[PDB]
Amino acid sequence: GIIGAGVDPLSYVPMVGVTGKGFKLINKALVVGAESAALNVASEGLRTSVAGGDADYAGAALGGFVFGAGMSAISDAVAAGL
Amino acid sequence: ADPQLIAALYPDQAELFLTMDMMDKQGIDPQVILDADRLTVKRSKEQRFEDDKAFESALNASK
């Protein structure tokens, strides 16, 4: 629950330590039919050929999610400022 | 009469000012500080590193 939860985060710790790591956003809720397995031998997860491919993505996401939720909160704040 | 000034000039015994202001302004007994300041373990140079790091986390993560 990064949004749905959901926080700002506009007042948050400088967040130095975090890199990735154990960030997979299985929002509880917003999951509907949860077919555990697979559709084919494709699918799977990020189909990538570099090591770090599941952590570069994760990093991006933490950095994308935090920034997106923050832009949402700051646009709600400037809304009230207007 | 001027809590801040006496403390400011002597930036060494803030411990005494804290204990005295505990003793008189707040209602605690000047007996329950005595044991806890007499019963203390020597920080023994080990758990301190953890203590310096400690001053640093509750400070930064305070907001």
Side-chain angles (χ1 to χ4, degrees):
Chain A
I2 195 53
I3 299 193
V7 42
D8 294 332
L10 272 191
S11 317
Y12 223 83
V13 177
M15 209 200 297
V16 156
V18 67
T19 43
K21 181 178 73 68
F23 175 70
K24 272 193 163 201
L25 209 307
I26 313 180
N27 191 0
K28 203 50 76 181
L30 268 61
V31 183
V32 164
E35 216 89 11
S36 60
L39 308 98
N40 241 201
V41 287
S43 178
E44 308 303 322
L46 215 65
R47 289 274 305 162
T48 206
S49 66
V50 260
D54 230 27
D56 50 0
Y57 180 68
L62 207 137
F65 273 122
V66 165
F67 173 75
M71 286 302 282
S72 89
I74 191 54
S75 160
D76 280 332
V78 70
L82 288 175
Chain B
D2 210 275
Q4 327 117 10
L5 257 176
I6 297 287
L9 312 171
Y10 318 113
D12 297 317
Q13 293 77 30
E15 306 138 85
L16 178 57
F17 300 152
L18 180 50
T19 358
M20 232 178 53
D21 194 57
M22 262 187 173
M23 206 176 99
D24 57 359
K25 189 176 296 297
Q26 309 179 22
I28 58 179
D29 225 323
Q31 176 66 39
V32 114
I33 308 172
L34 266 298
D35 19 49
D37 210 305
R38 193 256 209 202
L39 183 142
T40 111
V41 223
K42 125 214 294 242
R43 100 205 135 194
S44 311
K45 172 60 214 71
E46 166 57 36
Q47 124 166 327
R48 105 140 18 154
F49 210 8
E50 281 57 55
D51 211 9
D52 320 325
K53 298 306 275 302
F55 180 62
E56 304 301 330
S57 11
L59 211 63
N60 285 47
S62 243
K63 246 309 111 198

